[PDB]
Amino acid sequence: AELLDIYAQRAAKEGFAFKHDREQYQLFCDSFPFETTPDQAQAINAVLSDMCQPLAMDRLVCGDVGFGKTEVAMRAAFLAVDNHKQVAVLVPTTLLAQQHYDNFRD
RNA sequence: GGAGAGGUA
DNA sequence: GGGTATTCGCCGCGTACCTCTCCTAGCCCGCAAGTATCCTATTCCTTGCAGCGGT
Numbered sequence A: 001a002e003l004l005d006i007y008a009q010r011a012a013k014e015g016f017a018f019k020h021d022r023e024q025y026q027l028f029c030d031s032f033p034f035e036t037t038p039d040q041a042q043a044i045n046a047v048l049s050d051m052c053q054p055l056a057m058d059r060l061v062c063g064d065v066g067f068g069k070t071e072v073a074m075r076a077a078f079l080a081v082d083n084h085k086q087v088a089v090l091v092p093t094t095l096l097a098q099q100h101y102d103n104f105r106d
Numbered sequence B: 001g002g003a004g005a006g007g008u009a
Numbered sequence C: 001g002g003g004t005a006t007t008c009g010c011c012g013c014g015t016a017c018c019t020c021t022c023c024t025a026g027c028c029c030g031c032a033a034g035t036a037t038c039c040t041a042t043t044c045c046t047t048g049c050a051g052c053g054g055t
Helices: A002-012 A022-030 A038-051 A069-082 A094-105
Strands: none
Touching (some): A022 A069, A038 A069, A069 A094
16 A cells, blocks of 8 residues: 555656756766766666656666666766755665765765 | 165055 | 085075265375574663862
8 A cells, every 4th residue: 555655646746857957067977087888878868868857767777786887876966966956875784875975975 | 876874655 | 435414604685765964094295384593774771980170
């Protein structure tokens, strides 16, 4: 019952349509000391395109370990926080909390 | 279908 | 040898109809269903020794 009601409530109303800046997000892209591989960049584009829609984004980023999964989330968080939306990160351990704190702060 | 129990003439 | 007696085992004991109950024990194997130890959050407090005002 609880899960059915949550799904119905989330599928009923329309989520925030993020506003994307091209050149300002380009600086954040320039801050990355690597080149996004064509698949990581494609996941990034899908994520940003979905965030920039009225519909609520529900997505999975299932890729193999160590393939830059974190950076896609960092770009999505930058897009969200550019619009002052208080990104919330949830990791299932303290070491992940500390490591992601360090990486995001950097 | 077969066993066992009871019953009628 | 043999005529006799004695024992032993087999075969047999009516028709027709009506009501009811009950037809293997046990094992095994796989389903599946219900439990003791390991990390990251939480609510639960009770001691030991040095500062420290204050006189």
